[PDB]
Coordinates of C-alpha atoms and ligand atoms in Angstrom, one line a residue:
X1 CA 14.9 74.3 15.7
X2 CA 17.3 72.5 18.3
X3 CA 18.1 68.9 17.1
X4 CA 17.7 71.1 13.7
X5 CA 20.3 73.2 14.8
X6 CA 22.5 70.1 16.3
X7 CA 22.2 68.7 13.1
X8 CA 23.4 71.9 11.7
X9 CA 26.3 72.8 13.7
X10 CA 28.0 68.9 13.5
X11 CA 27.2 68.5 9.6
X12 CA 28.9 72.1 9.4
X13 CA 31.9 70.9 11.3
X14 CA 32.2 67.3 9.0
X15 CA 31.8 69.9 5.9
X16 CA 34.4 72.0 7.0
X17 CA 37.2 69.4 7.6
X18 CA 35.8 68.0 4.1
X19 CA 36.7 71.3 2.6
X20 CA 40.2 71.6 4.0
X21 CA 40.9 67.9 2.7
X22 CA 40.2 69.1 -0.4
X23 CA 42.3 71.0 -3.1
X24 CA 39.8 73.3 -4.8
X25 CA 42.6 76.0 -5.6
X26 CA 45.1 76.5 -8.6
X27 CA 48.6 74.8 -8.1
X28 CA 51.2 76.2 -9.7
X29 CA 54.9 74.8 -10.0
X30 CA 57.6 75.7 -11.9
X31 CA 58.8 73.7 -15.0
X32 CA 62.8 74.6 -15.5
X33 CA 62.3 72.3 -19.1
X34 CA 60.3 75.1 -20.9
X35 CA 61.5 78.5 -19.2
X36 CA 57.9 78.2 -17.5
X37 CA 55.2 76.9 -15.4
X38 CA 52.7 74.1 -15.4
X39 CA 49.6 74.0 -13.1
X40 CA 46.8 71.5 -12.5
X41 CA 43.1 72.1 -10.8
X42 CA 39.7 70.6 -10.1
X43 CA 37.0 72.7 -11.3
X44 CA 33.2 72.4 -10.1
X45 CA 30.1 73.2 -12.2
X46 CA 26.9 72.5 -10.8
X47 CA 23.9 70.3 -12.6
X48 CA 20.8 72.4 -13.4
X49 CA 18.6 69.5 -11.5
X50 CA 21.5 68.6 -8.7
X51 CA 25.0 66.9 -8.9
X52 CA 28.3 68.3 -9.9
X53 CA 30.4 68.1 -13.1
X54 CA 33.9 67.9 -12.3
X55 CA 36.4 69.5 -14.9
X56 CA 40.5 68.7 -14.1
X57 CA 42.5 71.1 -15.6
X58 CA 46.1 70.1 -16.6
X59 CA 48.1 73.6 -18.2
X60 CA 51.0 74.9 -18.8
X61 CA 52.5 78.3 -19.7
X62 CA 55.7 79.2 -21.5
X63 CA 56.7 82.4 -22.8
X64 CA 56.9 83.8 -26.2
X65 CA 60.0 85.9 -26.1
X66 CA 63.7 85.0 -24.9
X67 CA 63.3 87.7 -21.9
X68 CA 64.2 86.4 -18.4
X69 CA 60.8 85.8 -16.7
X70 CA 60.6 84.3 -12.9
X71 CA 60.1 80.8 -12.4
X72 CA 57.9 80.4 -9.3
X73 CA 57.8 78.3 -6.1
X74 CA 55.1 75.9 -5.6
X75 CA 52.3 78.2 -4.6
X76 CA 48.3 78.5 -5.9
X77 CA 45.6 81.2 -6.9
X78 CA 42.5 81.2 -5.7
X79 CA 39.7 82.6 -8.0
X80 CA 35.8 83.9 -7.0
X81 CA 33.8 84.2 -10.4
X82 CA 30.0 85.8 -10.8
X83 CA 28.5 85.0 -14.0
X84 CA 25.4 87.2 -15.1
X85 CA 23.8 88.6 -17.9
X86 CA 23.4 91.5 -19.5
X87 CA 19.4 92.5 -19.6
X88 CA 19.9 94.7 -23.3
X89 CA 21.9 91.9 -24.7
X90 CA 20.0 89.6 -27.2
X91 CA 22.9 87.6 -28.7
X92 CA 24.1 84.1 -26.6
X93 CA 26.7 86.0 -23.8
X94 CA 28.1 85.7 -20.6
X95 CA 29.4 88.5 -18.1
X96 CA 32.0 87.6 -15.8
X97 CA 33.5 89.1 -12.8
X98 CA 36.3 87.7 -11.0
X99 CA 39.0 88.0 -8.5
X100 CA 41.9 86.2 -9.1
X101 CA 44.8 86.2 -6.0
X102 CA 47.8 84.0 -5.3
X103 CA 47.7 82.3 -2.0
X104 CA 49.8 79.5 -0.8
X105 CA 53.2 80.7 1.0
X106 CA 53.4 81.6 4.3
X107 CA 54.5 84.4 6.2
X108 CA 58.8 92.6 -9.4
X109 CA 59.8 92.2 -12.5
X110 CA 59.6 94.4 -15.1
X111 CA 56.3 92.9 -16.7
X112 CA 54.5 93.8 -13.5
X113 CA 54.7 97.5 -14.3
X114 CA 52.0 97.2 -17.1
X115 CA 49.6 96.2 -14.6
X116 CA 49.5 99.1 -12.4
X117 CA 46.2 100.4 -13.5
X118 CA 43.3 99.5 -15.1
X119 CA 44.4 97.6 -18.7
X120 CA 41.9 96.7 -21.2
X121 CA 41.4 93.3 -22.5
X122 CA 40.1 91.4 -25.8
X123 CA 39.2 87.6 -26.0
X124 CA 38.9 85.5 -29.5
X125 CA 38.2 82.6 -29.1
X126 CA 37.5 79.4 -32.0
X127 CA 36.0 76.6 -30.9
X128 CA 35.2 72.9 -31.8
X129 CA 33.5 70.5 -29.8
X130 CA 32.8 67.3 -31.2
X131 CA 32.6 69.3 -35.1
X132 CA 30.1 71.7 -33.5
X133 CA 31.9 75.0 -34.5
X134 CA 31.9 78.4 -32.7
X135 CA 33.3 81.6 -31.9
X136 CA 33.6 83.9 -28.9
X137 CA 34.4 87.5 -28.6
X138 CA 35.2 89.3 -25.3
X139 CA 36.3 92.6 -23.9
X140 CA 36.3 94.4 -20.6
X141 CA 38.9 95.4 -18.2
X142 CA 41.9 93.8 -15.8
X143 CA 42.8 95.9 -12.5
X144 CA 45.5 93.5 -11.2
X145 CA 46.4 95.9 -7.9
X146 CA 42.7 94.1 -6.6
X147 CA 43.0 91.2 -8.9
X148 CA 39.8 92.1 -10.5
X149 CA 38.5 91.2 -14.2
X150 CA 35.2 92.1 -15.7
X151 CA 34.9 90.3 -19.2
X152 CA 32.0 90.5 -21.4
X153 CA 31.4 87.6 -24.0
X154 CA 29.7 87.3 -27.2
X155 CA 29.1 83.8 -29.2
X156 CA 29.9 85.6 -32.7
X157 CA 28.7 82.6 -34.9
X158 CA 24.9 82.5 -33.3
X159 CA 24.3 79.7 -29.9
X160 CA 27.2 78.4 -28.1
X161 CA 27.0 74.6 -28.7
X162 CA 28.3 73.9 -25.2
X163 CA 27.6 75.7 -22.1
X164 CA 28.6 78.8 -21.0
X165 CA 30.4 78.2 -17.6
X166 CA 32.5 75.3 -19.5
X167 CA 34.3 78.3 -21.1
X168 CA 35.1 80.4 -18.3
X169 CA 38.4 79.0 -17.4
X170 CA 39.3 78.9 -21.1
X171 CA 38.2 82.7 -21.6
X172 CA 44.2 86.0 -18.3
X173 CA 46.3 84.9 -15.2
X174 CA 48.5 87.4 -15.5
X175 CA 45.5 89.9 -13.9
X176 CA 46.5 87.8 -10.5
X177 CA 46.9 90.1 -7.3
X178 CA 50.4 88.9 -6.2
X179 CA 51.1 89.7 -2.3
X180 CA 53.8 91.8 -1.4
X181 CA 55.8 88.6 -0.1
X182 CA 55.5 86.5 -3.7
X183 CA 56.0 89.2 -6.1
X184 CA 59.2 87.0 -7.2
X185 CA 56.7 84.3 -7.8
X186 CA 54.7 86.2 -10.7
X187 CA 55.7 84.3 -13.7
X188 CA 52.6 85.5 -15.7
X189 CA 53.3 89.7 -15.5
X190 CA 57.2 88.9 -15.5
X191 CA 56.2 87.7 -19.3
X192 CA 54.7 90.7 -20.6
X193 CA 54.7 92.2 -23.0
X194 CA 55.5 89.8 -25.3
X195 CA 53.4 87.4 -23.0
X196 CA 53.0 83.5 -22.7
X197 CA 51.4 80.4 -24.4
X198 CA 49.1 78.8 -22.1
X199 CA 47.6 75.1 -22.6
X200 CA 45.8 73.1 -21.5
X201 CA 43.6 69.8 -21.4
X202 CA 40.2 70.2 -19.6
X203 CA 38.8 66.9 -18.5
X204 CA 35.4 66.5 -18.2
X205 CA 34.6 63.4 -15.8
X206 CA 32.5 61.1 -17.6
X207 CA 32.5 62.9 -20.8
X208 CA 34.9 64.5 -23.5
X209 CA 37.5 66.5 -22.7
X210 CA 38.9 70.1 -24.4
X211 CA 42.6 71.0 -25.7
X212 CA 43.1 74.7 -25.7
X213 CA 46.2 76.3 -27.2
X214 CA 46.2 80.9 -26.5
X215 CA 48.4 83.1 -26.6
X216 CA 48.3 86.3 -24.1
X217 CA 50.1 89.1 -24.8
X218 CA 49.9 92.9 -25.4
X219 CA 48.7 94.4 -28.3
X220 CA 49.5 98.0 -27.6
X221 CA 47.7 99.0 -24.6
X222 CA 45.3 95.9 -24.4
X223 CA 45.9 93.0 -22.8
X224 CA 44.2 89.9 -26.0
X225 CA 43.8 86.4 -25.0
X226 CA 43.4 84.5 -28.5
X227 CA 42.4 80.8 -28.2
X228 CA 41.3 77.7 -29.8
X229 CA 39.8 74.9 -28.3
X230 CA 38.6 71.4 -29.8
X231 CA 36.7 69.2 -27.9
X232 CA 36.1 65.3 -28.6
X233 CA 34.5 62.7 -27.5
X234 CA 31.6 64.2 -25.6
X235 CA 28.6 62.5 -25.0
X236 CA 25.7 64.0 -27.2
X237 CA 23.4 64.0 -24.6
X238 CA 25.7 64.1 -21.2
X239 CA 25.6 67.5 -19.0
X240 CA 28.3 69.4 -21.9
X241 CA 26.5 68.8 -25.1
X242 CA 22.8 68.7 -23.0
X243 CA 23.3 72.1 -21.6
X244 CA 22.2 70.5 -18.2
X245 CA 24.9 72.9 -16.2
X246 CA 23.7 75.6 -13.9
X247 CA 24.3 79.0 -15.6
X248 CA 24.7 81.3 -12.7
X249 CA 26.0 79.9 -9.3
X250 CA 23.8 82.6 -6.6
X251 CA 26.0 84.4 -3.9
X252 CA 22.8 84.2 -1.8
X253 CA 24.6 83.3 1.5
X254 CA 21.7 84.2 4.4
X255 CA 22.3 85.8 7.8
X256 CA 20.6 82.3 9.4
X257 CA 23.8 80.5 6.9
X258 CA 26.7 82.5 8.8
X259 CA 25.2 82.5 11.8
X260 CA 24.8 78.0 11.3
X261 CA 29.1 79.0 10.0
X262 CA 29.9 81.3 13.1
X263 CA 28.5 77.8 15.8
X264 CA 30.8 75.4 13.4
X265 CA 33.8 77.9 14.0
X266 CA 33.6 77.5 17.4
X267 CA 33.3 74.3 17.7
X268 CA 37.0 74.5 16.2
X269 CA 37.7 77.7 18.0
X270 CA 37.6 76.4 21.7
X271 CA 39.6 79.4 23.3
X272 CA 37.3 81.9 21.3
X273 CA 40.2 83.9 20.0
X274 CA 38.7 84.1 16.5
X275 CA 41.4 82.3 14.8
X276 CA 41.5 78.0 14.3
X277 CA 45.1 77.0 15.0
X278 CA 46.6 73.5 14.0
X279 CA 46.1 72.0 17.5
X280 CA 42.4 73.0 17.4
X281 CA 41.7 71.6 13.7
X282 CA 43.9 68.3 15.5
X283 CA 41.3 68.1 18.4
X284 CA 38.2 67.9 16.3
X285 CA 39.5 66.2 13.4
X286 CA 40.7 62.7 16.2
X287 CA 37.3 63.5 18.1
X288 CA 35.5 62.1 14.7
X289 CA 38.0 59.2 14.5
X290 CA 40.6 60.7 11.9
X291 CA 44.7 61.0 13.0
X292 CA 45.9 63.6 11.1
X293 CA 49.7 64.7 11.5
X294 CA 51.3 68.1 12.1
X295 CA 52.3 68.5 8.4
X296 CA 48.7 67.4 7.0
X297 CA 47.0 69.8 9.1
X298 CA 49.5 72.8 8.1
X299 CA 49.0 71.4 4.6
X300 CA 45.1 71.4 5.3
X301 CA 44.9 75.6 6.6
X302 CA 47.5 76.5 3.8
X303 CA 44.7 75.4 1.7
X304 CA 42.2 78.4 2.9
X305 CA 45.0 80.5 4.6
X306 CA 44.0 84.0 2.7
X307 CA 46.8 86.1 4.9
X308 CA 49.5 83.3 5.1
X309 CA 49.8 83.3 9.0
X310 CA 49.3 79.8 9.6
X311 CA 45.7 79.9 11.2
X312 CA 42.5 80.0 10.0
X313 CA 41.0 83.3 10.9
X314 CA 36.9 83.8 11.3
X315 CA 36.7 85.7 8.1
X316 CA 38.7 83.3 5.9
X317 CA 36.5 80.1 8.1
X318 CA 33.3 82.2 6.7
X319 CA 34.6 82.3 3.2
X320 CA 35.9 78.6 2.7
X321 CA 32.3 77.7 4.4
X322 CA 30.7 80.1 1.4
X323 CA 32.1 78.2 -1.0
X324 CA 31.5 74.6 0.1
X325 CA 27.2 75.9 0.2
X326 CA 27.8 77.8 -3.3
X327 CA 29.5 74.5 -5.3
X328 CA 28.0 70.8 -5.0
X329 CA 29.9 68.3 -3.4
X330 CA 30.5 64.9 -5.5
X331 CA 28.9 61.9 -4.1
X332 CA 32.1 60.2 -3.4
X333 CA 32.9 63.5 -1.0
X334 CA 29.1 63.2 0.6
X335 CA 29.4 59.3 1.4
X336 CA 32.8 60.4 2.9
X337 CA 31.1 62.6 5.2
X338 CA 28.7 60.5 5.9
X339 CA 30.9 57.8 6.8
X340 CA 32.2 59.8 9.6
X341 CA 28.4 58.9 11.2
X342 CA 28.2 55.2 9.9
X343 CA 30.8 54.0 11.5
X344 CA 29.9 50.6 10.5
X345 CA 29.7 51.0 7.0
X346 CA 26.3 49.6 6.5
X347 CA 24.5 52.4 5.3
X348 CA 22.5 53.6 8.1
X349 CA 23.4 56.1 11.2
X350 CA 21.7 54.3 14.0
X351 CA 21.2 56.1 17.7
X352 CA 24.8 54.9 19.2
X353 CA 26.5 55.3 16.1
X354 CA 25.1 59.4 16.5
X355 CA 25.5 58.7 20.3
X356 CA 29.2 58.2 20.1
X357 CA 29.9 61.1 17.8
X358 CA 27.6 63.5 19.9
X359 CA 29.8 62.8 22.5
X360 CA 33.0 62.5 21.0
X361 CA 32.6 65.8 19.9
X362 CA 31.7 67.0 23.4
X363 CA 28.1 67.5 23.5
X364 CA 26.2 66.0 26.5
X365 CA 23.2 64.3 24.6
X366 CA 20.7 62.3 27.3
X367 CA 19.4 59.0 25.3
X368 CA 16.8 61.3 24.5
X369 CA 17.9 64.2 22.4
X370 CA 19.9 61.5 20.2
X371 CA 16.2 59.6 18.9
X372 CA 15.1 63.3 18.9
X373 CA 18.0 64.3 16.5
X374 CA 17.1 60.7 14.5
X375 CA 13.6 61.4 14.2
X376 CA 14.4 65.0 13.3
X377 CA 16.0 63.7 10.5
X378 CA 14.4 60.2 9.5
X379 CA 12.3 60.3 6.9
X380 CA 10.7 56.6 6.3
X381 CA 10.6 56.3 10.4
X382 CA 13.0 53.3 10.7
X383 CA 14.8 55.0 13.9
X384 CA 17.9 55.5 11.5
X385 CA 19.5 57.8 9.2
X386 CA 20.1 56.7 5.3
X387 CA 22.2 58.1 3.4
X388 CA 19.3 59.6 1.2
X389 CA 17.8 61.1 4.8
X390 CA 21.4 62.3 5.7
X391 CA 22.0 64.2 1.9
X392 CA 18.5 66.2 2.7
X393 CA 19.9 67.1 6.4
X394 CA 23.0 68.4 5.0
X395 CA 21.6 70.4 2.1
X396 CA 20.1 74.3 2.7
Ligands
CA1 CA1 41.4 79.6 18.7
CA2 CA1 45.0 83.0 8.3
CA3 CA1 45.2 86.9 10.9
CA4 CA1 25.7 52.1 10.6
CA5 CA1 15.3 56.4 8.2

């Protein structure tokens, strides 16, 4: 409960720089060639018994009528989801919150005004993976003002073949809260009514892949999603076809967990005025032995940057951290950060390599808090780390 908590606060700090090198949000550009966007994302679902299954996206959206719709800068959304179920449902279903809000450029058309209020929604959805057929209905409600969906799904033809969370992508952008500043960049309300194809390929890594074709458009009053989807070349017992994905991701995010967050912050946070500026996330990140420039580390806050001001506030730190506990990292991202401590590449954190981080990163460490912090950690009592040791350290 003190080289615990050093281990804590430095594999917070290497998790948190690991999270704003990554690109977890949706990217949006505009494509001139079809009157419309395209986008591209990396999509997470956790293994049942540990791991991550990645999913890239590729899409693209064009609209259905001739109507002058706005073709967007470069920006992203950035999308929370809660799956759960229904305790008086007994077919195969999913219930699904989200919050959907564009992000992504710092500090309305016509179509927006159908979105003002609350606007029902219906999903149909026909499916094929690998000749396993299926269908889906949904319905619910989009209040775009908070960017908020609620969606309940029904598999219509009996059990859904593949699992459930593989869908939710699949299964209305247009229910995106737009900021004040990038209402010009709204190309999915500026289609409506008459609304938008959107497609895509869904690539599962080391398994099959989907092709989805919907059109979203109004229908009256509700907003209806129809799709279909084929599927090919999954694997018949991989993590798709095996069901072996976690169903429902927990929001259980402890007071111990923020606290662990709030003495990573301020390891970034060195003036304690709440907010991680450019030249803070500069400091840290060379203190571990990276050299990032001024342009990759506006690049890296844009990434999390929730209000657009350039900094990354406490609030938006403690969100981004949320996220990176809630969603598995892939073992290419966990050698990464556990690189940072074997320096040498040979698999094993030894007591200087530790040493010279310690003390890179500022903390005084006698010679003998470091073999505490080893022995804290090592398992098989070698006096150093492996990468197996370091992977229990950094989980919860
Ligand atoms: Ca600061
Ligand atoms: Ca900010
Ligand atoms: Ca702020
Ligand atoms: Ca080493
Ligand atoms: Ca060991």
């Amino acid at each position: 409960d003190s080289s615990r908590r050093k281990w804590n606060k430095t594999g917070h700090a290497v998790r948190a720089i690991g999270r704003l090198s990554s690109l977890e949000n949706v990217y949006i550009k505009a494509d001139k060639q079809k009157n419309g966007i395209k986008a591209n994302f990396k999509h997470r679902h956790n293994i049942e018994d540990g791991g991550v299954q990645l999913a890239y996206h590729y899409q693209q959206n064009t609209p259905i009528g001739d109507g002058p719709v706005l073709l967007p800068d470069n920006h992203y959304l950035s999308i929370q989801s809660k799956l759960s179920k229904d305790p008086n449902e007994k077919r195969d279903h999913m219930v699904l919150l989200e919050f959907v809000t564009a992000a992504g450029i710092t500090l309305v058309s016509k179509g927006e005004e159908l979105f003002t209020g609350v606007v029902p929604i219906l999903v149909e959805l026909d499916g094929d993976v690998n000749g396993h057929k299926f269908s889906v209905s949904g319905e619910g409600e989009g209040d775009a003002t908070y960017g908020k969906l609620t969606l309940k799904f029904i598999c219509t033809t009996g059990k859904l073949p593949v699992p459930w969370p593989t869908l939710v992508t699949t299964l209305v952008l247009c229910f995106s809260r737009y900021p004040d500043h990038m209402k010009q960049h709204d190309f999915f309300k500026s289609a409506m009514p008459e609304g938008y194809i959107q497609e895509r390929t869904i690539f599962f890594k080391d398994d099959g892949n989907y092709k989805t074709r919907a059109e979203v458009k109004f229908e009256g009053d509700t907003l209806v999603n129809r799709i279909e989807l084929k599927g090919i070349d999954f694997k018949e017992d991989g993590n798709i076809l095996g069901h072996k994905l976690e169903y429902n991701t927990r929001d259980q995010l402890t007071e111990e967990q923020i606290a662990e967050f709030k003495e990573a912050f301020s390891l970034f946070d060195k003036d304690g005025d709440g907010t991680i500026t450019t030249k803070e996330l500069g400091t840290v990140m060379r203190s571990l032995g990276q050299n990032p420039t001024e342009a990759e580390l506006q690049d890296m806050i844009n990434e999390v940057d929730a209000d657009g001001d350039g900094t990354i506030d406490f609030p938006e730190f403690l969100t981004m951290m949320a996220r990176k506990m809630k969603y598995t990292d892939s073992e290419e991202e966990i050698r990464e950060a556990f690189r940072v401590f074997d320096k040498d590449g040979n698999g094993y954190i030894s007591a200087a390599e530790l040493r010279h981080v310690m003390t890179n990163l500022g903390e005084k460490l006698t010679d003998e808090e470091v073999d505490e912090m080893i022995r804290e950690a090592d398992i098989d009592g070698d006096g150093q780390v492996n990468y197996e040791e370091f992977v229990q350290m950094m989980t919860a």
